[PDB]
């Protein structure tokens, strides 16, 4: 059993405390684990003309959005997948439980 907690969101602060709560639940009891792995942020970028029509000086835009991805690696038997499965979910961030 190789439970891994994958978290993706657009709000860094809300994703940070979810990892903090997950890691604080991990360091309680025993739960030897691996800490937050900081994957590079995926920055979407769609460049579009500001003008809805064709008239006007060439003025482009860039609507960007940052995705922060961090995974939490756990290692323990069923006596914590009755406990970790209690999702500490805030609006925005999502969790995907993956074992092995």
């Amino acid at each position: 059993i190789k439970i891994r907690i994958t978290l993706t969101s657009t709000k860094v602060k809300q994703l940070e405390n979810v990892s903090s709560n997950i890691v604080k639940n991990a360091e309680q009891h025993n739960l030897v684990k691996k800490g937050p792995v900081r994957l590079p942020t995926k920055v979407l970028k769609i460049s579009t003309r500001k003008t809805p029509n064709g008239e006007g000086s060439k003025t482009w835009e860039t609507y960007e959005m940052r995705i922060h991805k961090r995974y939490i690696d756990l290692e323990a038997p069923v006596q914590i997948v009755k406990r970790i499965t209690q999702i500490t979910i805030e609006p925005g961030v999502d969790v995907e439980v993956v074992v092995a």
Binding site: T10, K42, L44, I67
Partner: peptide, 8 residues
């Protein structure tokens, strides 16, 4: 994928 999921 995560990029398409959050766009969706």
């Amino acid at each position: 994928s995560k990029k398409r999921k959050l766009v969706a």
